[PDB]
Structure 1
């Protein structure tokens, strides 16, 4: 019994040490004769060369240096088996390296101050504005690139505190109170925050200023 295909999933920024053993190739001509293993492809013998190698006789696939997913997220190499008489009896084997994400990028708001406006009598639940923070990490297979939004605080507290909320995923800020009145309060300042790993990672801070309209 065997795997139909076995990609190797390798976290970026490994400590190693290097060179680091990945998995071991085995030719089909096992007992018979002496086999020599080689590999080819982008990452081995074309750009970028020598990121991967193979032990000619064993043939342990080796990683020679830490990877960076945001540079190259996937490698596709080929493994070759050749006897000491130069003959092969098997096709190249597809070797697939999937570089898995680490949380090596901090979230960044696209602006340090966001601006919105809202009419003094709208229905509670009404969208006021939407803020955005980006993260270069992967947000498809990991949370490392996924930002969770929050509001740290709000000024002034008039009529009262907690007049707005922000959607945790979308960053749409909403008003959740009646009693907006420019006359008493023309503008609100909210500290907003975004935290990667969907709330568990690191945080960054910006300001949202909400103008009350007539």
Structure 2
């Protein structure tokens, strides 16, 4: 052809229909004799078996089911070409398959509860703590794995509500009001959120507990 194929990029979670054609393998010895094609490697003849196949007669490389980037992100397979008289007519061909991302993981907070303390007299603008959520999707080329933080809600609501903020990118929680008074309200429970696609995607929650120190 030459007996080569460029790396193939396949987005995960393809709709099909399956089996899906990716590339047609072909040995120029098929002018001379009938060629039988086959494939080996993890994803073909070793676990996960049968994700990919090749059609014996035609050389079509097929994907049999949708892929999942977070299970396996890249496959390295080998294609074979054998004459009808049983002789290999090519050295095995390196077939590289790269699985590209879709946004299919929700963020996950690293803790169900995060705790931080401040002195009663801290001024507005004071950083209390930094929370974190991870996201298994790509955050280099897209926002699939990019988390935006927000505050869902605060209890109690004394001396008033929305006394805290969270930095949309860093997860740093700050107090933005005056009026902390430990003798009145010694602790606040914040329900916090993390949302992928930098705020447009899906959202998980955790708790941040703010202790007013004595």
**Range class of TM-score, shorter chain:** 0.7 to 0.9
Report the secondary structure of 2:174's partner residue: strand
Q: CA deviation at 1:180?
A: 3.4
Q: CA deviation at 1:53?
A: 0.7
CA 1:55/1:191 → structure 2, altered by over 3 Å: closer, same or farther?
A: same
The 8 Å contact of residues 3 and 26 in structure 2, kept in 1 or not, is answered as no
Paired positions, count: 214
Q: Quick check: 1-10 or 55-64, which moved more?
A: 1-10
Match of 2:79 in 1: 79
CA 1:173/1:64 → structure 2, altered by over 3 Å: closer, same or farther?
A: same
Match of 1:211 in 2: 211
CA 1:31/1:2 → structure 2, altered by over 3 Å: closer, same or farther?
A: closer
Specify every segment of 5 or more residues in structure 2 that has no aligned partner in the other structure, as ranges.
none
Aligned-residue RMSD, C-alpha: 3.1
The 8 Å contact of residues 3 and 27 in structure 2, kept in 1 or not, is answered as no
* Distance in 2, Cα, partners of 1:25 & 1:123: 69
Q: CA deviation at 1:95?
A: 0.8
* Distance in 2, Cα, partners of 1:28 & 1:169: 55
The 8 Å contact of residues 101 and 142 in structure 1, kept in 2 or not, is answered as no
Q: CA deviation at 1:61?
A: 0.4
Report the secondary structure of 1:29's partner residue: helix
CA 1:19/1:5 → structure 2, altered by over 3 Å: closer, same or farther?
A: closer
Q: CA deviation at 1:5?
A: 6.6
The 8 Å contact of residues 28 and 90 in structure 1, kept in 2 or not, is answered as no
Report the secondary structure of 1:114's partner residue: strand
Q: CA deviation at 1:143?
A: 3.2
CA 1:119/1:28 → structure 2, altered by over 3 Å: closer, same or farther?
A: farther
The 8 Å contact of residues 137 and 144 in structure 1, kept in 2 or not, is answered as yes
Output the TM-score relative to the length of structure 2. 0.81
CA 1:162/1:45 → structure 2, altered by over 3 Å: closer, same or farther?
A: same
The 8 Å contact of residues 148 and 199 in structure 1, kept in 2 or not, is answered as yes
* Distance in 2, Cα, partners of 1:4 & 1:153: 58
Output the TM-score relative to the length of structure 1. 0.81
The CA deviation string for residues 34-73 of structure 1, in whole angstroms up to 9 with x for no partner, is: 3332211111112222221111232110112222323222
Match of 1:47 in 2: 47
CA 1:32/1:203 → structure 2, altered by over 3 Å: closer, same or farther?
A: same
